[PDB]
Amino acid sequence: VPETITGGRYSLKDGYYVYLDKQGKQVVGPKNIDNHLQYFDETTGKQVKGDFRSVNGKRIYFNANLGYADDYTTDVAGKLVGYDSNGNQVKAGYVTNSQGKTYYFNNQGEAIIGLKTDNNKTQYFGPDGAQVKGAFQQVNGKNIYFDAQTGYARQNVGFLDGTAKGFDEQGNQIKSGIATDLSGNVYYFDASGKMLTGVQNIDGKKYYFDEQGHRRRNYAGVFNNEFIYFGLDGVGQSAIEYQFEKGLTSQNSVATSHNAAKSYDTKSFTNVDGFLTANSWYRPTDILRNGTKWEPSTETDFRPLLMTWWPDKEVQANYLNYMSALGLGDQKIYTGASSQLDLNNAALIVQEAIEKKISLEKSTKWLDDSIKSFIKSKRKDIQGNLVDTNPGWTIDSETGSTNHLQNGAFIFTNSPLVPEANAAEGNRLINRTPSQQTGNHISYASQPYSGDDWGYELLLGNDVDNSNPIVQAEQLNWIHYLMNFGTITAPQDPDAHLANFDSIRIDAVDNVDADLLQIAGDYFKAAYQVGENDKNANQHIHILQDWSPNDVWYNQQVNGNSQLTMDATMQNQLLASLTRPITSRDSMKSFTKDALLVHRTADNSYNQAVPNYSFIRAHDSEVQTIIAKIISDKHPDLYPTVDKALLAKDSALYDEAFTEYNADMQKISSQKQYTHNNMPSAYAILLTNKDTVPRVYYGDLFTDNGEYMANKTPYYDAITSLLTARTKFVSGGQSLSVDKNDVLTSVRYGKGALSATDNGSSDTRNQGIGVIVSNNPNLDLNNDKVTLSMGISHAHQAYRPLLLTNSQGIVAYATDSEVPQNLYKTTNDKGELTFDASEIKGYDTVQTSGYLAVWVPVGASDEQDARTIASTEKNNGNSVYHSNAALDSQLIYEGFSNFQTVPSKNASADEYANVIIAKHAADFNKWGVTSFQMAPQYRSSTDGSFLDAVDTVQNGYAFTDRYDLGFNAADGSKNPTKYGTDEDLRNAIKSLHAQKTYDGSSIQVMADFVPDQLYNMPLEQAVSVIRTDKYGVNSENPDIQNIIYAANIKSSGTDYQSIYGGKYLAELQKNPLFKSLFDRIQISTKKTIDPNTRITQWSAKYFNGSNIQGKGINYVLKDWASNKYFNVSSNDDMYSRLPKQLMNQESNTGFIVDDIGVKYYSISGYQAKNTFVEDGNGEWYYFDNDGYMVKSTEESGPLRTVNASSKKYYILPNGVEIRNSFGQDIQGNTYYFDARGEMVTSQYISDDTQNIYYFNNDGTMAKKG
Ligand SMILES: OC[C@H]1O[C@H](OC[C@H]2O[C@H](OC[C@H]3O[C@H](OC[C@H]4O[C@H](O)[C@H](O)[C@@H](O)[C@@H]4O)[C@H](O)[C@@H](O)[C@@H]3O)[C@H](O)[C@@H](O)[C@@H]2O)[C@H](O)[C@@H](O)[C@@H]1O
Ligand SMILES: [Ca+2]
């Protein structure tokens, strides 16, 4: 029996492929994988490809490609018999040889020769048993074509031996009949097999065939002195006879006096900056009260606009149907074809029911809902699928680039139609990432390091413009508010000064103007004199979220080191070499490469390395992506891509995924299908490393979901043992190594000593840790020995373990006395430890793959602390921080996860995280924490536009009011954020501040500074928009070029932004210490910061752009004839006046034939001037400056420039402007006209049937033959 293997990937060794087991081991012999049987060689473990092996007796062939077992025919004599994939002979069925020959065998097992007439699909087989595909074969002069993929007879035209000969399925030449090629080309022949070109009459219907014989669609031109237009049918339509309904329909009714608007100004209409939308309501002069008596309307008698007016018949019809479905309208179906007068009468029948329902309910809220759902309603199509009923008012119409986290984006631009949503000149500078701050990319990177930039301006939601000086100021104000949160929010309290934040984490560095880094750096020199010395600097440790490789070096040269850069090379190497499964895993020798940021192979100096903070996981990185992977595997239907699974927001899915994620964390390393292996081995390297500030993720001590701090991970004992050990032993110089067996040994020599040869100080002897790490579950040393080279400072010294590994797990020893006598071992005269195979071997537990050990020196006191005090001396150079003993004494703790359960409305006091933080304050001080990175404390949105904004998470990165950190409601209801109230928060900070570290100063508390975006904003505003991707590159959709959009982009002006916005700028300017900050010329703007305007209400002029909101392109209402937007707040001529019916004026709609020409009036009653106009969802027409339709004549040909934009259109004598269509001169030349109706030049245009034509710069088609 070939065993089935399931988990494990393929590898390439020596130019052949091998398969690695879940255990880690190469597989040998005949084995099933992927449901297809493959063989693997006895010694080299090599996969067999295109050879013969014997799996349990029977002779089996394996594919040249993929390695899978397959069919084969061997001809010893006569006809080869042929064999199934699993051995055995074929009694009656197809097999395909490796050469690609396909034979069919009879019941007797001989190869079938000649014709093979199956169950309704005749086939052929030539002599020698091969099937024929893709050629014509005369069985007996039939000349029957056989398909390339299947040997089935097909109708096809064969250009051999003459031209245009057509043959059918049974193989008769199709004289006087229609024939069809493989590409779908349609020929027509005459009696005696010769094809036809030009205009033909087939069944009282005209068709056009070009010069190579193809019957054609969407082709216009004069033929035998008759202008014909052959449509999608291929059928000729008269281009003289009009294609529109002649005659006008009055929109004046008995009811229009009463439904006319009370007034024609802002008073009577609900509006967005004057513009009207689909959800607009208005006050008619009269109300049909209880559907029985016309009364004068009161101040509160507003009704939906859509009740009495619509932008066209198509929406009118659909409205009537939808309300009829809600049981209000009449029981009968209407269409855009249906007559105008009938729709208007039907609408008045609906109104009667609407008002009767309002009288009954004593409310109009039910109506508001049913109008909102009508706008977003869906419908059956001719295909049978769900489309949108009103595409113009949905996401459907906002098509562009997909490259953005929320599937689209806009950029705000200026435009004279919306004067108040226009930004100043030289603002809205996008993509000023650290790399592109000057406006051009600059590689600051040196020789073996990368200098790329993965930044982009539009990340999420509504994107704030941080190239505006007024905004840059409000960002400074917000920092000041946070650094003085306590004193500001609770002035009555005497201890308010203890409830203040100390440092910040700058979020989305690659998505905002990099000027904000220098602004922030200036603040802390002014306020807290961080520049003076290490002591001051290290009391405020800030961090960057700077993912791009180049940002490390930008930070160093441009930004001083005003914030700490992340180490990405370490995180990546720690993930690659330890966390991955055995199949994907990098070697430990990689830790000694050159492309690492900090070389630790012989780190022996201070103030040389780049100041940095390194980590393994974080609330976003390597957390959410793993959950998504599980969602994808469990629900392929809904989410097939790992990227697609990130977009999911349903809690049931996550709940399901987490129970797996939690259950998988418990499993042994070899069967960890989703989670990270070797977590304690990774943290063992991280927390012992020199020249770095380690950051520990909440979710590695505790479970990423559920109650805060409630459930521990498998790794808690190991990691908390390391953290306290860091406090007592880790100091001095470092050196990594990796022996021939691939076993890492990290050594710290202890305070005073910087190398192995250093004799050190008094402090040295009892300090300095030693770490051993292998990532090989099948490690077997045998004769070879592993060596920990401690210093000569540690010669002839007794050492005891801190961590060791068993099959059961990892043993942590807290004190020397907990250690058994046998484990103790003493160093030799050189300061070396030696390890046997009887000691160090391969393991596979839950907590380790390979082996982990950590050894410390025996006889440390309890007062012993390895950490070093910050220097007070002046520092030279430009770095704010300096990577040395004192900085490495610091340690950050990211004390939150996204997926912490959200305490319910009536949750008890101590379910909220900030209460729990206070209770466990001393726990953090015993782990060596000097900075506590709190979550963003801002009130989260719940609209679900992104993971961070769904109600089950509310992590706080998705916020509307960024001065609101959990304040009470207006009535005095406690109203906490996911983590607790402003009071609960202020305590938590005091609690952390009460804790005192090794140097007697408090634990720092870090605010999460999020300058990039704002979510879910209350008030609409009109803006000009262009459809783009995340970089702000124009996706160049014609309909979305500087059009007007009703964006939710304006704050309420009664929120905490209005209270505290820019409040402290005046005050700061007056301070001398801040003079440097305000005088600085910022790199990107080249202008100074501007603190003279306060931002109390956010508005569209302070934003670069926004993610797509799915209001729709035509959500802002607009008369099609005039092609102007409706505006109530202005009496300007660039806006259209209200539809004539709504101001009780005479109004008519329709086409009107006139002696001079043809005029068209919209549903609103206005005349079409200088506009394209679609009719009855079919034909387009253009109307000139004089309000007359443009039509071609005999004197003036069909090819015309109409708009004076140098753009040429093809217009028939109907006035019909043909689109996606070919057109002809009277001379003979052919032109093609694209989706938009305009002529094509210098371009190949493809054809539905795979024909291709080339059109010159001229516009004319290149003729063929
Ligand atoms: O370049 C470094 C990479 O090396 C490894 O590549 C693994 C491959 O994984 C998948 O395919 C698995 C496939 O591998 C062999 O066949 C390879 C291909 O051979 C043909 O040319 C054939 O026509 C192809 O159809 C076939 O894929 C095995 O014989 C076969 O059984 C397996 O199905 C990917 O589709 C490939 O693109 C990869 O090369 C390593 O695993 C990667 O992670 C490395 O990046
Ligand atoms: Ca931005």
Ligand SMILES: [Pr+3]
């Ligand atoms: Pr007349």
Ligand SMILES: [Pr+3]
């Ligand atoms: Pr349409």
Ligand SMILES: [Pr+3]
């Ligand atoms: Pr029609």
